[PDB]
Structure 1
Amino acid sequence: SKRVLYVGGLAEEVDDKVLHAAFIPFGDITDIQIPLDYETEKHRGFAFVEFELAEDAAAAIDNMNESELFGRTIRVNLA
């Protein structure tokens, strides 16, 4: 589909709550996935945000790609 976004460049403390607040303005979010390093406790700096509507995902990409989050430049593309 074209409803799931790949989001890279996430600071270590960015979590599901942070991601949801940053992306919910574009439309309903179905789920957020944050792959973790099993040995350690933290994530790897990227996540997946799935929108209910492809149209909302598109708007999210257009606005969020190369934007700032926790002082880091993030990259947003179709997963």
Structure 2
Amino acid sequence: MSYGRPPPDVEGMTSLKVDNLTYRTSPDTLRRVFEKYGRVGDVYIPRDRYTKESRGFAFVRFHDKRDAEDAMDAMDGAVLDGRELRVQMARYGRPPDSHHS
């Protein structure tokens, strides 16, 4: 018996990423729709820069994979507005160059 289970060895990363919008979902709705499971270290929409529309995806990012695990396991394909929300690790989390952590 299964259903999909929690993420695999994403232990090598930490940042979350969220995508799929309807042009009106906005970062604010995503904020309280994702931080609710724990927190939202970052929430923004990489939309256009010279028009009144968007690319069709956001970029919520989580500073902690644990809060991202539950939110993603409870928001991936959760169809927030009627389009089928998408949630997945942003792969990021490593330290910058000339430094380590």
Amino acid at match of 1:3: S
Task: Could you tell me which runs of 5 or more consecutive residues in structure 1 were left unpaired when the two chains were aligned.
Answer: none
Shift of 1:4: 2.3
Aligned structure 1 segments of 4 or more residues deviating by more than 3 angstroms: none
Does 1:74 find its partner at 2:85? Answer: yes
Shift of 1:56: 0.7
Alignment TM-score, normalising by the size of structure 2: 0.68
Aligned length: 78
Residues 27 and 53, structure 1, Cα contact 8 Å, conserved in 2: no
Task: Please show how residues 40-79 of structure 1 align to structure 2 within 5 Å.
Answer: 40-79=51-90
Q: Which residue in 2 is equivalent to 1:2? A: 14
Give me the whole-angstrom Cα distance separating, in 1, the residues matched to 2:30 and 2:54: 13
Task: Could you tell me which runs of 5 or more consecutive residues in structure 2 were left unpaired when the two chains were aligned.
Answer: 1-12, 91-101
* Secondary structure, counterpart of 1:57 in structure 2: helix
More strand by share: 1
Cα RMSD for the two superposed structures:
1.4
Identity %: 36
* Secondary structure, counterpart of 2:52 in structure 1: coil
**Structure whose CA Rg is larger:** 2
Alignment TM-score, normalising by the size of structure 1: 0.84
Shift of 1:12: 0.8
Amino acid at match of 2:80: L
